[PDB]
Design goal:
The structure holds 2 chains of a larger assembly.
Chain A (H helix, E strand, L loop, with lengths): L3 H21 L3 H5 L8 H29 L4 H14 L1 H6 L1 H7 L15 H27 L7 H32 L2 H22 L27 H7 L2 H25 L19 H6 L2 H21 L6 H29 L4 E5 L4 E5 L7 H24 L7 H24 L22 H27 L6
Antiparallel strand pairs in A: 1-2
Helix pairs in contact in A: 1-7, 1-8, 1-9, 3-7, 3-16, 4-7, 4-9, 7-16, 8-9, 8-13, 8-15, 11-14, 11-16, 11-17, 13-15, 14-15, 14-17
The complex binds a molecule of 2 linked components (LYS-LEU) (2 copies).
């Protein structure tokens, strides 16, 4: 022990940061379709798409800022400051007293009659995305540096609870904050994540007195020679060009898991959801963020079992000693869950032809089938086993396979390739929606999937995941042969 | 080279042996339901079940005979002699001139009116099964001993063409011999496999002059001490008790692949099969052995591609150096094929509700769907990739992981555990047919599956295969750690 405070402070900072981030993405589309904006669905979705795109693209640049110029701690503080500065825009816009201060004074109430307060919300989204980008690429290596002098097992044990805190903040946001934004006063609904950001900044500032920081290395990126003589700078390029194919093969894995995360909630919208006695009935409604947290809850339950039972057994039996093998196991569980979801959708698509029941979730009617929502339990347990096997392993791999000088930059490139996979998954979803292929071609997301073929999409995702699993297993052997052999 | 004749003779012997064996099992049920016997379907199926059971149970005993008493070459010759002696019973029974010599003189022609010539056919089946049992357990180690002094790569290359010859004899039997037994004169239909057995015996006798044999070791099994001091006899037990869990975990793999081999042909019976111009039309009919060889043809096509392209690349890239990893890859392909077959059956079960077409294969009407048989091409290509990855690897593993003194016995135990898996698969098929579970509960095999749920059975087989794949991958690491480390 001894360094328990330096880890707890980073865990709390990441928890609050993820809570605020999943608060801004849980009801942003519904907020843009409201009194102050009255935007259309296309632009409302494009706003969140550009937000996540800036978050993914900005992430590497945040690592370069934390490595070449700043010390990866002042970088986190500055990024959290820019994050908090952009967080006030949403409560200031939702408040009628300050909506006049932001831009004009929004008159449109029933959306009877092209964007209002566009620069304000766009600057807020840009600053929030850049803040999340610079934080996520610098919070995992700086957090793992607190226990780096104890061995890789300490970093893995820390990353376990790091992921656990990320999906306890996500549950606290999607469960509590989103329900507040959906049914009760909205100004406080957006003010709570801002308070979370402020508390995270304060916690990091107080924890700076016990953190073990590293001085910046400015003359590290200028020595990326590409024409072929100081030493220890050649190895930083040899250890960098060898980890690129791993991320390239992980891109389609991100594609499959992001499309699965979207389509799983989309399918959960079309199942029989039980009514909470007096929480989702009149005059309130059930938020969709709970259907989204249906998999963070399982992860939160699962992680303590892996850290206490699975990891010691696998360590004392010599099973899965490297992170790449755990990533392969996670991808196998991902394709298994995709096949299970395809089976469940094939069974569900036969029930909607006979009888459909109407349910209201997002103040909209969904024609669900006569099938309990708890039938998604196996398909969610499988992705729960996969993320605790693939995501934590990928994080500790990006932390360990990176050079000592370039860590935040490599983590930012990891998140950027994850975002590239997400965009490839969006393009794949748009590809199967053409007139040639009738799979998922009724309308855009959050609609009616009774006329679509989601089981075929799940089977295609499973086949793709299996192919990229074989590819990753092929390239994993070619990479582990240079870790302790060459 | 230099030893090309000693390998070609064993390949031809195995080819003819497998051809005769797959000739006796292609139309045995239809033969027992005919003029000389007029048996019922239950006893006709029980006869083949007991035949295969004696084949599987007898296999280890054949290895003990080839190791403790005989020299594994005289054992093969004696087993082939007993095989040929039991092969004459079927042509002698089918011939009207000798049917009176066998037992009485069978009068029942239209089966108007409890077994006729029961001792004759039972003794023939018993002797043929014991012959196949003693041959299969002694033909692979004796055949692999011709190239054992060149390295494991030579044994793997030999086993490739060994499997290729096994499924070229199977095609020559199911394609040519079964079509002769189905439409044209039946006496010659059963006399052809007997000629094949005689030719195999003659070929082995002529090739005995170039085979490299091993003297028998009688004092090898008496030293299986189980209470706990000559050396090299303790290692023979340590290398024997360690390979038992591998076979125990391979048992459910055999269960899944035997049930798949049965249900794949059963599903192929319910698809649109094109008519050969003047081969399957009046007055002839399409044999089911061709629908069964639909996967041996693909294997025959695939094997030369693996021996010439896949193996050199995997060798020069350090990929899959052990047989257990290839077995795991084969099991992964098996579960992938099971999922694909489940998808295809889910698509097929929706077409039979609208329109069904009638087709005659075994002189019986099948209500097939309006779906081409060539849609089974992916599900058969996957099992083709699996067998060339799992079966050859399992054979070379049973040959290499066995002690030098006990090889045929270990191969016989391998085939016995395969048969145990087959019987477990039969019990599993009988388990899902209870009144509680409506999966495959219309009737016995070779019937109507339009009222059954074969897609659910395929999904269950896929889940079981994945579970046993994870188990095998877990136990594979615990076994490879004592090959070159301990
Ligand atoms: C791999 C990264 C990009 C994703 C990771 N996701 C989670 O932690 C989820 N378990 C949270 C669930 C909320 C929506 N389904 C992350 O948070 O960074
Ligand atoms: C693993 C052993 C027991 C099976 C093996 N099977 C084959 O070779 C098939 N490819 C033959 C196909 C004919 C019926 N589908 C064997 O022959 O021993």
């Amino acid at each position: 022990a001894g360094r328990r405070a330096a880890c707890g402070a980073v865990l709390l900072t990441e928890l609050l940061e993820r809570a605020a981030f999943y608060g801004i993405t849980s009801n942003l589309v519904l907020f843009l379709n409201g009194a102050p904006f009255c935007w259309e669905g296309a632009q409302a979705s494009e706003a969140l798409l550009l937000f996540m795109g800036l978050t993914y693209l900005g992430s590497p640049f945040g690592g370069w800022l934390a490595d070449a110029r700043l010390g990866r701690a002042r970088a986190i503080l500055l990024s959290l400051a820019l994050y908090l500065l952009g967080m006030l825009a949403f409560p200031l816009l939702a408040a009628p007293a300050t909506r006049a201060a932001l831009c004009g004074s929004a008159r449109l109430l029933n959306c009877t009659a092209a964007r209002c307060c566009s620069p304000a919300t766009f600057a807020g989204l840009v600053l929030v995305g850049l803040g999340v980008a610079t934080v996520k690429a610098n919070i995992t290596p700086f957090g793992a540096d607190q226990v780096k002098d104890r061995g890789p097992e300490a970093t893995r044990r820390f990353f376990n609870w790091f992921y656990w805190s990320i999906n306890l903040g996500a549950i606290l946001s999607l469960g509590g904050i989103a329900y507040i934004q959906q049914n009760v006063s909205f100004v406080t609904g957006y003010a709570i994540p801002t308070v979370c950001v402020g508390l995270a900044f304060v916690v990091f500032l107080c924890g700076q007195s016990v953190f073990i920081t590293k001085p910046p290395d400015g003359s590290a990126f200028t020595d990326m020679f590409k024409i072929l003589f100081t030493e220890e700078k050649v190895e930083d390029v040899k250890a960098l060009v060898k980890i690129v194919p791993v991320f390239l093969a992980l891109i389609p894995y991100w594609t499959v898991y992001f499309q699965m995360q979207t389509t799983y909630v989309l399918q959960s919208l079309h199942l029989r959801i039980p009514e909470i006695s007096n929480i989702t009935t009149t005059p309130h409604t059930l938020p969709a963020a709970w259907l989204t947290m249906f998999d963070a809850v399982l992860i939160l339950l699962l992680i303590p079992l892996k850290d206490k039972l699975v990891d010691p057994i696998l360590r004392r039996h010599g099973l899965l000693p490297s992170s790449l093998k755990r990533i392969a196991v996670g991808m196998f569980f991902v394709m298994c869950s995709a096949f299970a979801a395809g089976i469940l959708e094939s069974k569900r698509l036969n029930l909607v032809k006979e009888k459909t029941i109407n349910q209201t979730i997002g103040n909209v009617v969904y024609h669900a089938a006569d099938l309990s929502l708890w039938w998604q339990v196996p398909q969610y347990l499988l992705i729960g086993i996969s993320e605790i096997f693939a995501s934590i392993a990928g994080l500790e791999f990006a932390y360990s396979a990176a050079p000592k000088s370039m860590q935040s930059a490599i983590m930012g490139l990891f998140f950027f390739f994850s975002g590239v996979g997400s965009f490839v998954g969006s393009g794949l979803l748009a590809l199967v929606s053409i007139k040639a292929i009738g799979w998922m071609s009724s309308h855009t997301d959050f609609g009616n999937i009774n006329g679509c073929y989601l089981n075929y999409y799940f089977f295609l995702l499973a086949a793709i995941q299996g192919a990229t699993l074989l590819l990753f297993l092929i390239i994993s052997v070619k990479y582990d042969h240079h870790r302790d052999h060459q």
